[PDB]
């Protein structure tokens, strides 16, 4: 029912509401990025559909990592956040270099309802997809620190990654 | 109501899934901690009690990170998982050193129903959390890699951090 929107409101406050007031922060803090022009500084979050390599010809490649988000809780705890940036070829043109996140919440639907079913309907989830996709962008687009910071892409099989994402970047 | 469950099954099919059953193997490849006998290894996932430095005698202190956990999914995207190793000292005795995690799920509950009460209640929480304590029990109980892998720990103000961490280490 309404558990969406508990996995959505998770999403953001614990991660999406304060990475994305700061990634341009933090892309400009790393070296090998800062005077690499062509870098959509953006965070795509990537959402698979159906069910189960999204690089046949190889074009897509990890590059590294941006400068991590040193965040003491507390008092006491640290923990770090860093973002991963690849570079997906167009041609011989010049390369893309962009933040791609393969969206956890959504993914743990995917894999507890292929490991739970009576749990988690493959359909019961579908719904519970759609509304956390719904919900999460009515949160981010309600949060100026975070709008137009994101980006939702979404692919298939016959939807070629390295494809639908150079789509995305000439309209970035 | 069967929110909770939505928020420790993503817990876990997203980060207890592969963290713990390697947890003892990642930190026997962190050379500063391999020859420190003295180092439980075992997560301790800790939960805050009601709401807002749990550090004032300053016993415990961040002493590095653990190796991180390359984790490639769909042949494209890359994913570091390492966690945050502390010290805390015994008095004049030898000093412990243990693994903290500053619980994400749960602390997404209370840093939204103090922002979105209207969409989560001081009580419609408080029976979110005592369920999604229980649910996460009854998912690593019933995974073998996973079991005896954690702890959880419970404190308060009145409850000092420092204090109660080591009379769990003296009773694992
Ligand atoms: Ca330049
Ligand atoms: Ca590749
Ligand atoms: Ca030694
Ligand atoms: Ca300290």
Redesign the pocket.
């Known amino acids: 029912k309404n558990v969406a929107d508990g996995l959505a409101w998770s999403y953001y406050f614990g991660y999406l509401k304060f990475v994305l007031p700061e990634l341009e922060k933090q892309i400009e803090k790393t070296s090998k990025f800062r005077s690499k022009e062509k870098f959509v500084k953006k965070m795509f979050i990537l959402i698979p559909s159906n069910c189960f390599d999204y690089?046949p010809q190889?074009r897509?490649?990890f590059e590294g990592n941006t400068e991590p988000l040193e965040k003491t809780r507390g008092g006491v705890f640290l923990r770090h956040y860093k973002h991963s940036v690849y570079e997906i070829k167009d041609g011989e043109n010049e390369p893309w270099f962009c933040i791609m996140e393969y969206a956890t919440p959504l993914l743990t639907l995917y894999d507890m309802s292929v490991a739970q079913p009576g749990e988690l309907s493959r359909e019961e989830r579908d719904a519970q997809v759609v509304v956390f996709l719904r919900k999460l962008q009515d949160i981010l687009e309600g949060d100026r620190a975070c709008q137009g910071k994101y980006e939702l892409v979404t692919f298939s099989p016959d939807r070629d990654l390295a494809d639908v994402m150079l789509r995305k970047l000439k309209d970035s």
Chains 1, 2 share one sequence.
Do not use: A, K, L, W
Request: aromatic residues 0%; negative net charge.
């Open positions: 690089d190889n897509i490649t």
